[PDB]
Each structure stands twice: as structure tokens, then as C-alpha cells.
Amino acid sequence: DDQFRKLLYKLDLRLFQTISDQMTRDLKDILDINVSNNELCYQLKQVLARKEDL
Amino acid sequence: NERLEAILSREQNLLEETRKLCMNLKTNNKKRLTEKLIQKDLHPVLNKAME
Incomplete structure (x- = not known):
């Protein structure tokens, strides 16, 4: 019945x-x-292990 | 890490292409020795140096 209150409740x-x-x-x-x-x-850690191997 | 991969590949390829030359030189020396100055055109002078 109330657009302004229905509004406050719709935004809520x-x-x-x-x-x-x-x-x-x-x-x-x-x-x-x-x-x-x-x-x-x-x-x-895996990437660092690869770096060490190279 | 992938930059390091590239560096590894570079070093490996240059290592291989340097490696092949030793076998090349060995076979070339053996063949040239066995043909060029062992056939019968050898000047008998160089027989002493050759033996």
C-alpha cells in the first residue's frame, strides 16, 4: 500500500x-x-626446486 | 627458471658441435696418413723420417 515504505523495505x-x-x-x-x-x-616450493636443479 | 632452461640448451648445443670436431680430425688424420704418404710415390729420402 505504501511505495515509500515498500521502498525502504525493498532496499532493505x-x-x-x-x-x-x-x-x-x-x-x-x-x-x-x-x-x-x-x-x-x-x-x-616446486618452482624453487626446479631453479636449483638448473 | 625458463630463462635458465634456455641457457642450458645453448651450452648443450655448443658443447655438442665442439665435440664432433675431435672425431672428424681423428678420422681425417688416419685416412690422410694411410693414403697420401704410404702409397708407392714416396720419395725414398723421407723413408728415414717416416720410419
Whole structure:
């Protein structure tokens, strides 16, 4: 019935939907960045081993 | 690391192309000795130096 209040609630609903998706893949991102940082560190060890061999 | 790979390849190829010349020289010397001054046109003077 109220466009101005329906608005405040529509922007709140978009804020909460974007908060939902954003925190979901942001927490996925903290996990993924941690594991991939360790993983890339290990591959960097491999690269250094190649350097030593050469 | 890949730069180092390139350097390794360069050194290997120059090593090989320098290596082949020793066998070339050995075979050439043997053949030239066995043909050029062992056939019967040898001047009997050089018989003493040759033996």
C-alpha cells in the first residue's frame, strides 16, 4: 500500500539478499584464499626446486 | 627458471658441435696418413723420417 515504505523495505531486502550472497561467497573466499595460499606456496616450493636443479 | 632452461640448451648445443670436431680430425688424420704418404710415390729420402 505504501511505495515509500515498500521502498525502504525493498532496499532493505536487496541489502539483505546482497549481504546473504556476499557473505556466503566472502566466507567461501576466506576459506578458498587460505587453502589456495598454502597451495600456491607449495607450488612455489616446486618452482624453487626446479631453479636449483638448473 | 625458463630463462635458465634456455641457457642450458645453448651450452648443450655448443658443447655438442665442439665435440664432433675431435672425431672428424681423428678420422681425417688416419685416412690422410694411410693414403697420401704410404702409397708407392714416396720419395725414398723421407723413408728415414717416416720410419
